[PDB]
């Protein structure tokens, strides 16, 4: 008989991860990796947060069983997640209009929403920004959903092309899903202003879109509450929406897969009905979520002492990134750059388009050991005082 | 605009988890839970294994980062998993014919395999035993695969109907997937004999099936090596096969979601080619797997001192279940059951069909607070010397 795997086509190379393999292979000393997708501290390390170590020691001393969690995970983890997203006194919580499922990471939350929508609604189309996180298309496609793109990035002024965004979403029908990055847009770091959020919220209601928010970087732009203003503007006007949030970055719990899918409906009776089908899609996927990572988050957010520690560690991460953004611009200037890189200061989060062509990105990698994604995206959190000067010297040399 | 979630139908109750929710709510003090497949010790607790607590202490004091694992997880975890499945000096291992991905539990391993098959091959049908774990149909249906049933259990004699098995499977065409329980068949507890396994291994290669092994209870029938004989018979004869395994139960790591999906192809080139697509299906699902549980398992299996403790803890779990099976049969006769329950002694694992009708199972729950699955499956590992007498008095009362 002929094998079942005989004529399987090899999968293409992942953009972000395909670079990590080429970097680890590079035997040259001093190589710099700006294609990473995680945070690094002043010494180039991705440490475990102090609040997390404390929480983990408490769990080691007090856990008496590893018995299964419910399909939707730790209840306290859900309550605290909804407070972070909507605010302590949100009407969505008091009206019992939101239900939250603990998921393996923000990716798991997007996949659960995709499976839920594909199997239980007439949704057939998801609209994603161009550019966006490359994995968005894979997740919704995995459920058989068509993914269309809407305009976003003005590569001339390094700003949000709001006029083209509206025009490109003209063909988005009622009942279509429109995906928004809550804050720190990946990869451009360009976020709508509060006024622009409100315009989109109003337009979303008139057009009949189902908004889906991807919230992976709460606390990395301006602050916890500030970074949720855009979502809460939608929450105030919409009867229904979906939020896929992640704690991978703002708790440094990347490999513990800590995320949440939050479902909002018109009333308590409708969200409970819908949520039962979301739990069914989780049951047929991974059954129930991993406990350790979410227990840490729940312990920290429910303990005032630990939460004060965590919030300061998040501030330390946010402030270091802004300093590197400023130091990056000043050092490029110091090293003789004629191109204006001021837009870097105006962008939020770990990522920004350097504006380098693929040809310049290629020269950095093979000629200077500086590794960036082919799109020109660079992780500002991968920059340190020790590597800033070599990095900038390389960039200037290819401009 | 009408809502997208307005016309969603509530999901039905899970045959296993819907029962567990009822048990937690029951206020009667003498209630007994024989439903969910979770181990209980002599005191009715589900403790953390001592080896696990020690491994978790090591991790707490030596982990320096939570950085993402690779899509396929911890390497040593994958290596140790293949040794348990195939043996120390397996030809599959030395020939580099096997690839293993760490997955969120055994369920996650099933969904990953299903997603991988539905999107990269011509597989349309999956053959699952009748009866089987209820979630099997849900996992493969959600990936878009049709599920056909083949005969297995002889309800009159309480044994394996090996004739009806071979007959119903003659309708399975080449390229179809046939799911086998590696050991401790859920829910019957009847496993094929080594002679019957070898008969199925030979019939499989002839008809061109794609074997899929669900291995959730390795070490609970007779032993680690002994429980892999059936699989290792297929492995020494097949060019391709898939093994979804779980560490939820033999490590008591339920809520940390520790499993593996192992892919076997004809040669190292085909397996790496197919595995690249499996890693793609994982990326579009949960991205990468949770570390804590798998790290514990790898720490234990790689340290001879810890492993020695774990192997003894697993032996005690296996033996206690066997003692409860004997005690269960002896006590039923003591309490006046008359019917012969000797077949329970010949069944392996946690689960056994009590032979009770759905109506008797219903009476046990409403009238006596004894909670079993509607199929009559009872968890022997939930029986203790303290709850054996009330449990058996209730069963005799409904006979
Ligand atoms: C036969 C079978 N397959 C798969 C599973 C799922 O195991 P896990 O909890 O690790 O997802 C179980 C759990 O009971 C099982 O009995
Ligand atoms: C990182 C990221 C995710 C996924 O986060 P995980 O918790 O690692 O799964 C989703 N969306 C965006 C925009 C991200 O940057």
Author numbering:
A (entry chain A), B (entry chain B): -2 to 396
Mind quoting what the paper says about this structure?
E. coli aspartate aminotransferase (AAT) is a pyridoxal phosphate (PLP)-dependent enzyme that catalyses the reversible transamination of l-aspartate with α-ketoglutarate, yielding oxaloacetate and l-glutamate. During its catalytic cycle, AAT undergoes hinge movement to switch between an open conformation, in the ligand-free form, and a closed conformation upon association with substrates or inhibitors. Using our approach, we enrich the less populated but catalytically active closed conformation in order to increase catalytic efficiency (kcat/KM) with the non-native substrate l-phenylalanine, leading to altered substrate selectivity. Steady-state kinetics reveal kcat/KM increases of up to 100-fold towards this aromatic amino acid, resulting in a selectivity switch of up to 1900-fold, and structural analyses by room-temperature X-ray crystallography and multitemperature nuclear magnetic resonance (NMR) spectroscopy confirm that the conformational landscape is remodeled to favor the target state.
